[PDB]
Design the sequence.
DNA sequence: CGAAACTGTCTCACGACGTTTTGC
DNA sequence: GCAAAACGTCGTGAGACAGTTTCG
């Protein structure tokens, strides 16, 4: 439950609004009660020759990791608890991705809840829809509508 | 000669390191003495549906303008004086583009002497080589080397 | 089972120039 | 003659997912 310096949050919020992404996904997966996993991800993408900057975010944020994918790299943070702590503090300084950060926080708080009702889980999936709508979504497939394959 | 708020600068620096570009160019033009114009530009690019963010920047920075170019728009700041003032205050919070910022600042401060000595003009055209090397330059064509057509 | 990771890629939304036209 | 504006383009450097797997 680390407390972040405001100057750091202000700059990073700007950077996140730029090269960052706040993602919410519904991943079909049979091992789950509702045959889908609710996935949340905070990420920052950057050309690999500049990964030092992402590695630094790992150290500064105190959690997450950097993944290499060729000419580009990403700082990824998915652990729900640290993500909630982080987005809570980052959120007030965001200008382009604040709505989605808030939706993510809202989803996180409703996870245990939605993981018990086919309709509560479906409501949460509705939140995921909104986040995707707010992002420049171009290759999305699984939506709350598709999860509504739960009826039967 | 406007003084910007620190939290505004902190956020913007991060956003600039993300979607911005600090540019220096040598534009071949016959109307100039040394057949080239020293052009400097600070710009922030964004998908046109988010043009409001760029329009808002024009108000917050107090100078500059937004141009449209298809699916994308750009906030542009070229006026050398407000540019110098703006970058002077932003530069300390930059992390990926701090070097190019200080170089632009330096080019501006040396512009006057650059007009006289055809040799100082080439040394300034050096500063611009440096800036392009720092950016992810890939379509550049006019360098200090080409300027050396100042040999007759 | 389920939190989180490992792995790959579609379609841009940017970055970083260049070329031309003004205007004092 | 130089500053600032206009208008147009190369080649990504991002964003935003998808899909399958690890293992307490
Ligand atoms: Ca962006
Ligand atoms: Ca960037
Ligand atoms: Ca970007």
Sequence:
């Amino acid at each position: 439950n680390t407390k972040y310096n405001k100057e750091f949050l202000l700059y990073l919020a700007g950077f996140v609004d730029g090269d960052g992404s706040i993602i919410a996904q519904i991943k079909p997966n049979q091992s789950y009660k509702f045959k889908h996993q609710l996935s949340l991800t905070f990420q920052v993408t950057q050309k690999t020759q500049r990964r030092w900057f992402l590695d630094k975010l790992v150290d500064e944020i105190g959690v997450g990791y950097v993944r290499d994918r060729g000419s580009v790299s990403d700082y990824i943070l998915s652990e729900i608890k640290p993500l909630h702590n982080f987005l809570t503090q980052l959120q007030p300084f965001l200008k382009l991705k604040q709505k989605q950060a808030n939706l993510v926080l809202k989803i996180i708080e409703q996870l245990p809840s939605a993981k018990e009702s086919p309709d509560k889980f479906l409501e949460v999936c509705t939140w995921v829809d909104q986040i995707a709508a707010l992002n420049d979504s171009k290759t999305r497939k699984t939506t709350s509508e598709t999860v509504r394959a739960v009826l039967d």
